[PDB]
Every structure is written in C-alpha cells, then in structure tokens.
Design a binder for this molecule. Structure first.
Ligand SMILES: COC[C@H]1O[C@@H]2O[C@H]3[C@H](O)[C@@H](OC)[C@@H](O[C@H]4[C@H](O)[C@@H](O)[C@@H](O[C@H]5[C@H](O)[C@@H](O)[C@@H](O[C@H]6[C@H](OC)[C@@H](O)[C@@H](O[C@H]7[C@H](OC)[C@@H](OC)[C@@H](O[C@H]8[C@H](O)[C@@H](OC)[C@@H](O[C@H]1[C@H](O)[C@H]2OC)O[C@@H]8CO)O[C@@H]7CO)O[C@@H]6CO)O[C@@H]5CO)O[C@@H]4CO)O[C@@H]3CO
Ligand code: NI
Length: 57
C-alpha cells in the first residue's frame, strides 16, 4: 500500500549488466537481498541492494 517505495541511504555504482546505480536521496519503486527497482529519477530499471534503501513516500 506504500511499502514498495524507497529512498537511497547511500550512493551506489553499478557493477554488472543487471544492477542499477543510484545516488543518496534518489527514490526507487520496487517492481531477498537484491530487489528489482525502477529509479524515480531516471526511469531505469535494475537490481538494487535492499539494505541501501529505506522506506519513503
Ligand atoms: C518533452 O515534453 C513532452 C512530455 O512532457 C510531459 O512529460 C513530463 C512529465 O510529466 C514529467 O513527469 C513529472 C517529467 O518527466 C520525467 C519522468 O517522470 C521521469 O521518469 C524521467 O523520465 C525518464 C523516463 O522514465 C525514461 O524512460 C527515459 O525516457 C526516455 C525514453 O526511454 C524509454 C526514450 O525512448 C525517449 O522517449 C521518447 C519517446 O519514446 C518512448 C517518444 O514517444 C513518442 C517521445 O515522447 C513524447 C510522448 O509520446 C508524448 O506523450 C504525450 C509527449 O510527452 C509529454 C508528456 O505527455 C507530458 O506529461 C505531462 O512528448 C514526448 C516528447 O515528444 O519522445 C521521447 C523523448 O525522446 O527519451 C526519453 C527521455 O530520455 O528517460 C527519462 C528522463 O530521465 O524524467 C522525466 C523528465 O526528464 O517531465 C516530462 C517532460 O520532460
Ligand atoms: Ni505498501
């Protein structure tokens, strides 16, 4: 109901073909430890480390 939107607590740089870079404060919508997410800044989709993000509006 709102547990699928998150905000980045730390910067993250992509390592592979499937992960998603993001900056601290960037909001992510979620589509385990790695979550498929869409950046609400760039609209790009990829996997993010779930411990790098926290619930957000
Ligand atoms: C230019 O104005 C036209 C547009 O204006 C209004 O849109 C606003 C929008 O409401 C507003 O949102 C709050 C903001 O948008 C931001 C997005 O919300 C945010 O997610 C991000 O956007 C991302 C996307 O998520 C990514 O997908 C990507 O987009 C690029 C596309 O990659 C998939 C790429 O293909 C290319 O898009 C083309 C598009 O092809 C898919 C093509 O479609 C025909 C054409 O788009 C038309 C569109 O059809 C038409 O729709 C009615 C209209 O759109 C207006 C919205 O309706 C209006 O809403 C209020 O005109 C478009 C332009 O002619 O052209 C596209 C551009 O080439 O390029 C995409 C851009 O790279 O990356 C983006 C950016 O990160 O950021 C958005 C803001 O940058 O702003 C919008 C206006 O800029
Ligand atoms: Ni929810």
């Amino acid at each position: 109901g709102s547990h699928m939107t998150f905000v980045a607590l730390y910067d993250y740089e992509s390592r592979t073909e499937t992960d998603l870079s993001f900056k601290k404060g960037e909001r992510l919508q979620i589509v385990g430890d790695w979550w498929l997410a869409r950046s609400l800044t760039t609209g790009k989709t990829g996997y993010i480390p779930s411990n790098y993000v926290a619930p957000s509006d």
